[PDB]
């Protein structure tokens, strides 16, 4: 019969690993605040990806050295029987940077370990990086053959380039709350880019900041989907 190769092969024995780095408490000398509500995010992600049949590994309060070593070790594993790879980063951040408990780590350093040439058992497979962290300090006021080494990566950023990312101390972050809700409802129905578009809408319409500080009050947020994927991604098969 006629065959179409438009979607990633997601019927390998395992869906893959879902590494969640949950950084809540930071070393006093860094001057970084405690990320209240991040445990709600980590727990929501653990349950969401468990139901998607991913082998979830939750890591709490890792130093910059521990983050690099974890990523290196995970990239050196045999992922031949795995369909994909997911890494969720929950921490403080700047543009292109994620914070370890004792200091910064370049996002490029983390993602480079999974390049098509550096992690052979993941070549041609989707590598998803979900990042809940700030990408700067701007506030949104609102209104109304061979394959590339950078191919097959998807970066689901919580916020637009140069902007702050919002996290609620009780409910968790706007992005992760929305991501988990949309994956629970649409993972058995829609393609990943379409699920992420629903997350963009949810964060954009359902949330607005409340603060006694006028500078941080009534602010909005829009996530940023960055795709270097070459095929469509469906969490289901058959």
């Amino acid at each position: 019969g006629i065959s179409l190769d438009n979607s990633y092969k997601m019927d390998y024995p395992e869906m893959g690993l879902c590494i969640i780095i949950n950084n809540k408490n930071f070393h006093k000398s860094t001057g970084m605040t405690s990320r209240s509500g991040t445990d709600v995010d980590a727990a929501n992600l653990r349950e969401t990806f468990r139901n998607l049949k991913y082998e979830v590994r939750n890591k709490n309060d890792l130093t910059r050295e521990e983050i690099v070593e974890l990523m290196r070790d995970v990239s050196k594993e045999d992922h031949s029987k795995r369909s994909s790879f997911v890494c969720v980063l929950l921490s403080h951040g700047e543009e292109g940077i994620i914070f370890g408990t004792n200091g910064p780590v370049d996002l490029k350093k983390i993602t480079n370990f999974f390049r098509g040439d550096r992690c052979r058992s993941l070549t041609g497979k989707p590598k998803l990086f979900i990042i809940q962290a700030c990408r700067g300090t701007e506030l949104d006021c609102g209104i109304e053959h061979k394959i590339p080494v950078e191919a097959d990566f998807l970066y689901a950023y919580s916020t637009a380039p140069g902007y702050y990312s919002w996290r609620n101390s009780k409910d968790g972050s706007w992005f992760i709350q929305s991501l988990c809700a949309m994956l629970k409802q649409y993972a058995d129905k829609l393609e990943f880019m379409h699920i992420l578009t629903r997350v963009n809408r949810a964060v954009a319409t359902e949330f607005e900041s409340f603060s006694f500080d006028a500078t941080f009050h009534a602010k909005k947020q829009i996530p940023c989907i960055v795709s270097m994927l070459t095929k469509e991604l469906y969490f289901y098969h058959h």
């Binding site: 962290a133 919002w166 996290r167 101390s169």
Partner: peptide
């Protein structure tokens, strides 16, 4: 609400 807090920022990261």
């Amino acid at each position: 609400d807090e920022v990261d």
